[PDB]
Amino acid sequence: SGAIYVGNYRVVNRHLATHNDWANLVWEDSSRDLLVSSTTAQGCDTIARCDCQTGVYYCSSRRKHYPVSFSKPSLIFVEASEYYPARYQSHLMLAVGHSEPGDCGGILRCQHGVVGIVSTGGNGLVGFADVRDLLWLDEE
Ligand SMILES: Cn1nc(C(=O)NC[C@@H]2Cc3ccccc3CN2)c2ccccc21
Numbered sequence: 001s002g003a004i005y006v007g008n009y010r011v012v013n014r015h016l017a018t019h020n021d022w023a024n025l026v027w028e029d030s031s032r033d034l035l036v037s038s039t040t041a042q043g044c045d046t047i048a049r050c051d052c053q054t055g056v057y058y059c060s061s062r063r064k065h066y067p068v069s070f071s072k073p074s075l076i077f078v079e080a081s082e083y084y085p086a087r088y089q090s091h092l093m094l095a096v097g098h099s100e101p102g103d104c105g106g107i108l109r110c111q112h113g114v115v116g117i118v119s120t121g122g123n124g125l126v127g128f129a130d131v132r133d134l135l136w137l138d139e140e
């Protein structure tokens with residue numbers, strides 16, 4: 001679990017969005033596992049605007065933050081998991097490291113702020129849904 005709180009937006013994994021999320025929807029993409037809903041409260045997170053490929057991600061299944069190198073956002077085959085069919089997620093970044101399902105929503109961060117959220121994993125890789133191209137998270 002986990003979310004990004006920027007301005008009056010809440011960014012979550014689309015597969016973990018609540019009814020309150022869907023009832024207050026701004027934007028959703030199955031192609032990215034991202035959903036953004038509206039909040040009453042102002043959030044304190046800053047979105048990175050950059051092309052960093054090093055950062056740190058939170059791994060709930062180890063109660064640890066890990067430093068990683070990651071690929072630039074791309075179109076990636078997510079091999080079938082026990083609970084999710086094979087599908088192609090887009091705007092996806094991969095790193096070598098530990099992940100399990102309940103780590104989806106963990107933040108990846110660089111020197112510039114929040115880069116993305118854990119979205120995929122398997123065979124010793126962890127996949128992050130990028131948010132750095134969503135410039136509108138910064139305004140309105
Ligand atoms: C961190 N992590 N995440 C997942 C995961 O399945 N997330 C669901 C999410 C939504 C979804 C829906 C349809 C098709 C594919 C997908 C893929 N991404 C996972 C599985 C094994 C190990 C680690 C993992």
Ligand SMILES: [Zn+2]
Pocket residue numbers: 048049050051052110111112113
């Ligand atoms: Zn950066």
